[PDB]
Write an enzyme that holds these catalytic residues in place. Sequence first.
Site, PDB file in Angstrom:
ATOM      1  N   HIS B  41      46.893  53.255 -27.344  1.00  0.00           N
ATOM      2  CA  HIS B  41      47.768  53.771 -26.276  1.00  0.00           C
ATOM      3  C   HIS B  41      48.681  52.681 -25.656  1.00  0.00           C
ATOM      4  CE1 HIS B  41      45.574  52.043 -22.874  1.00  0.00           C
ATOM      5  NE2 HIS B  41      44.441  52.573 -23.302  1.00  0.00           N
ATOM      6  N   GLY B 143      44.979  47.201 -16.310  1.00  0.00           N
ATOM      7  CA  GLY B 143      45.171  46.085 -17.213  1.00  0.00           C
ATOM      8  C   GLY B 143      43.929  45.624 -17.944  1.00  0.00           C
ATOM      9  N   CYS B 145      42.238  47.243 -20.218  1.00  0.00           N
ATOM     10  CA  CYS B 145      42.109  47.799 -21.561  1.00  0.00           C
ATOM     11  C   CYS B 145      42.262  46.716 -22.612  1.00  0.00           C
ATOM     12  CB  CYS B 145      43.136  48.899 -21.797  1.00  0.00           C
ATOM     13  SG  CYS B 145      42.695  50.355 -20.848  1.00  0.00           S
TER      14      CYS B 145
HETATM   15  C1  LIG Z   1      43.690  50.079 -19.385  1.00  0.00           C
HETATM   16  N1  LIG Z   1      44.263  48.996 -19.079  1.00  0.00           N
HETATM   17  C2  LIG Z   1      43.301  51.140 -18.375  1.00  0.00           C
HETATM   18  C3  LIG Z   1      41.939  50.824 -17.751  1.00  0.00           C
HETATM   19  C4  LIG Z   1      41.541  51.824 -16.664  1.00  0.00           C
HETATM   20  C5  LIG Z   1      42.388  51.699 -15.404  1.00  0.00           C
HETATM   21  C6  LIG Z   1      41.399  51.743 -14.232  1.00  0.00           C
HETATM   22  N2  LIG Z   1      40.094  51.502 -14.828  1.00  0.00           N
HETATM   23  C7  LIG Z   1      40.153  51.539 -16.157  1.00  0.00           C
HETATM   24  O1  LIG Z   1      39.216  51.370 -16.903  1.00  0.00           O
HETATM   25  N3  LIG Z   1      43.315  52.457 -19.012  1.00  0.00           N
HETATM   26  C8  LIG Z   1      44.043  53.421 -18.441  1.00  0.00           C
HETATM   27  O2  LIG Z   1      44.577  53.231 -17.361  1.00  0.00           O
HETATM   28  C9  LIG Z   1      44.192  54.755 -19.131  1.00  0.00           C
HETATM   29  C10 LIG Z   1      45.587  54.925 -19.742  1.00  0.00           C
HETATM   30  C11 LIG Z   1      45.588  55.635 -21.105  1.00  0.00           C
HETATM   31  C12 LIG Z   1      44.324  56.472 -21.336  1.00  0.00           C
HETATM   32  C13 LIG Z   1      44.363  57.197 -22.682  1.00  0.00           C
HETATM   33  C14 LIG Z   1      45.621  58.045 -22.815  1.00  0.00           C
HETATM   34  C15 LIG Z   1      46.884  57.209 -22.613  1.00  0.00           C
HETATM   35  C16 LIG Z   1      46.841  56.499 -21.260  1.00  0.00           C
HETATM   36  N4  LIG Z   1      43.977  55.851 -18.197  1.00  0.00           N
HETATM   37  C17 LIG Z   1      42.784  56.112 -17.657  1.00  0.00           C
HETATM   38  O3  LIG Z   1      41.793  55.416 -17.884  1.00  0.00           O
HETATM   39  C18 LIG Z   1      42.736  57.311 -16.739  1.00  0.00           C
HETATM   40  N5  LIG Z   1      41.721  58.255 -17.152  1.00  0.00           N
HETATM   41  C19 LIG Z   1      41.997  59.419 -17.734  1.00  0.00           C
HETATM   42  O4  LIG Z   1      43.128  59.841 -17.908  1.00  0.00           O
HETATM   43  O5  LIG Z   1      40.880  60.228 -18.198  1.00  0.00           O
HETATM   44  C20 LIG Z   1      41.111  61.581 -18.614  1.00  0.00           C
HETATM   45  C21 LIG Z   1      41.365  62.502 -17.433  1.00  0.00           C
HETATM   46  C22 LIG Z   1      42.670  62.900 -17.113  1.00  0.00           C
HETATM   47  C23 LIG Z   1      42.901  63.750 -16.031  1.00  0.00           C
HETATM   48  C24 LIG Z   1      41.833  64.222 -15.265  1.00  0.00           C
HETATM   49  C25 LIG Z   1      40.537  63.839 -15.588  1.00  0.00           C
HETATM   50  C26 LIG Z   1      40.296  62.980 -16.670  1.00  0.00           C
HETATM   51  C27 LIG Z   1      42.444  56.845 -15.317  1.00  0.00           C
HETATM   52  C28 LIG Z   1      43.327  55.639 -14.990  1.00  0.00           C
HETATM   53  O6  LIG Z   1      42.690  57.920 -14.388  1.00  0.00           O
HETATM   54  C29 LIG Z   1      41.634  58.239 -13.460  1.00  0.00           C
HETATM   55  C30 LIG Z   1      40.628  59.188 -14.108  1.00  0.00           C
HETATM   56  C31 LIG Z   1      42.264  58.900 -12.234  1.00  0.00           C
HETATM   57  C32 LIG Z   1      40.883  56.985 -13.011  1.00  0.00           C
END
Ligand SMILES: *C(=N)[C@H](C[C@@H]1CCNC1=O)NC(=O)[C@H](CC1CCCCC1)NC(=O)[C@@H](NC(=O)OCc1ccccc1)[C@@H](C)OC(C)(C)C
Lengths: 306, 306
Positions: B41, B143, B145
Amino acid sequence: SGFRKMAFPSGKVEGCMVQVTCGTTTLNGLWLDDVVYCPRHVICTSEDMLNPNYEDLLIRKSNHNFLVQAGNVQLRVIGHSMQNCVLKLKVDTANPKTPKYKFVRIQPGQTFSVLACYNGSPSGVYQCAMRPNFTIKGSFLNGSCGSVGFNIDYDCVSFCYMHHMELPTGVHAGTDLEGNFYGPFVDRQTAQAAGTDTTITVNVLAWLYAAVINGDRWFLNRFTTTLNDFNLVAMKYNYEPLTQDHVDILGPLSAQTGIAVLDMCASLKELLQNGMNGRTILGSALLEDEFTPFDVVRQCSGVTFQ
Amino acid sequence: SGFRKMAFPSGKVEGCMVQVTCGTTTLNGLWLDDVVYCPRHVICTSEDMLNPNYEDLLIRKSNHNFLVQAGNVQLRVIGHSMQNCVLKLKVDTANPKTPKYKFVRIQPGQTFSVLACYNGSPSGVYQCAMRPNFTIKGSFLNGSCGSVGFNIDYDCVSFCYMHHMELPTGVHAGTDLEGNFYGPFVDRQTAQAAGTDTTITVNVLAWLYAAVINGDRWFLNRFTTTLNDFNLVAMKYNYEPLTQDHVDILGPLSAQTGIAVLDMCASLKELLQNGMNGRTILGSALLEDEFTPFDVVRQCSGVTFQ
Ligand SMILES: *C(=N)[C@H](C[C@@H]1CCNC1=O)NC(=O)[C@H](CC1CCCCC1)NC(=O)[C@@H](NC(=O)OCc1ccccc1)[C@@H](C)OC(C)(C)C
Ligand SMILES: *C(=N)[C@H](C[C@@H]1CCNC1=O)NC(=O)[C@H](CC1CCCCC1)NC(=O)[C@@H](NC(=O)OCc1ccccc1)[C@@H](C)OC(C)(C)C
């Protein structure tokens, strides 16, 4: 989010660990520039331990009595000297992996990472606090002496602890890197004991702030307290007194969460009075006191190191 | 003596972390030989996250779209490919700090150390378990990830986890280093949730053995139980079932302490039935399940790594 017992990355210290052998005793040493630091009881034998005179013992040693191993490489000792309870072995080779570093003597309550070593080989890393009674609750077996505790600030390694001994209650005592013991302990095998410990109040409060930053609010209340009235309840529960300096240090965490320090104190007061009632805070059923205000901010905001 | 949440020394992994930038997104990558591994991603934008087609997205990218920073050094990407949910960027330079390593996909219950990173710079190290619901309770901010989880066996680094996302309950999901998610999670921003978790029974038992090795015996009893009768009580308290394989793995710890596995089970049964009654085990007021039988033996016997 999340909150973990986080240690500093240990690589800068791993490249400094060596094995020091003298007579029948092997332990770890710390190799920085052309000097190897290690506990002076390496020069002790199984019959010297009772009341050794290290000055006598050391004047009787030659350089070639010290066998220093750095990986598959022997270093030759070209001089030695004693500074308090640490031995300094001058070797003919400067460690090319020497990080930028300081030696610092920490206050009770401060935390640090321990790189536990055997035979100069790192075994694991974990986070410790210096307890108010100047012991640390470590994890240490035979051969772990000379393992160091440390902090990192950007690129600089601040060494604050070298391991020397275990006390009968299974806690640990050691020195700063200039060889001065933390606490009243001495490096001779005579009856010594830890002394009564207390809980590090300012750290419990910081960890309660960490919980709020991470979404746990169940323990907050509407009340407030004065510093005096808080400290009167803390003494009863064997907590360190909270000072205005502590209050000031908790300022940034107060401002980020919007919970006045004295309000968080009112909350800790009810936690001490009523217990947690089968609930947990940050995955703990105990009030946790080995995170400083700096540790919380570091982990809840993401400070790195080069 | 003592018992701590011990992570592996992180230095072998620190020398592999790099920064990967693509468009408006920066995260961490893992540089081994001439390949940099990172979450796919990174090629997503703020409007791609909803239901991205990564194959479409990737065929639209050029090598020069990927900015890989290793310290003060830019690496040039000379090829790219996607393997499941990880991107592999081939660079023109082999990492000279590449340790001996494997990629391994772990079973729920196994533990590993996480080196948390931001902008390719290590921030801290801590110990994790893969939970039975294939999440990990990490500590991760924006950040983070591309941070990896890992084990070390003598000189070999077994990478088992790369971080991808946080779920709404604040726990974390990611992949093995071949890009396969642990659990049913997918890398798109759609409603996903962790699933009901359970306690890792075999690990609680190992930690009770650790406590006995360290001098805590207050929780033992004279009773015994059968595996069937134990598992009937475990289900009631949301514990993973204990198998004969688990029993066999707990053999060495049984023989060193002299407490039959099924007797230790009888002890855990009364702990679940009666609680701990205001007492602690190894400094914990909760039954701890993130130490494997191997972790206990490692720390209570002193295994090192070169
Ligand atoms: C990477 N750098 C980052 C690490 C996160 C940030 C905070 N703590 C962490 O571990 N990863 C992301 O921010 C990631 C971006 C990607 C995810 C895959 C698709 C492309 C974008 N996003 C998340 O981890 C979000 N989680 C998420 O979307 O889970 C599915 C979901 C969606 C909607 C409703 C429920 C579940 C996080 C940042 O979002 C929440 C859950 C609000 C924390
Ligand atoms: C170093 N490699 C080693 C680490 C210890 C071993 C187990 N866990 C550790 O942290 N250090 C020692 O083994 C050390 C040897 C030195 C100590 C200074 C004087 C010269 C020898 N010994 C100890 O740590 C012992 N502790 C001790 O003697 O404390 C004072 C004392 C003496 C008698 C009665 C009460 C207190 C340990 C190994 O001995 C006990 C306390 C039984 C654990």
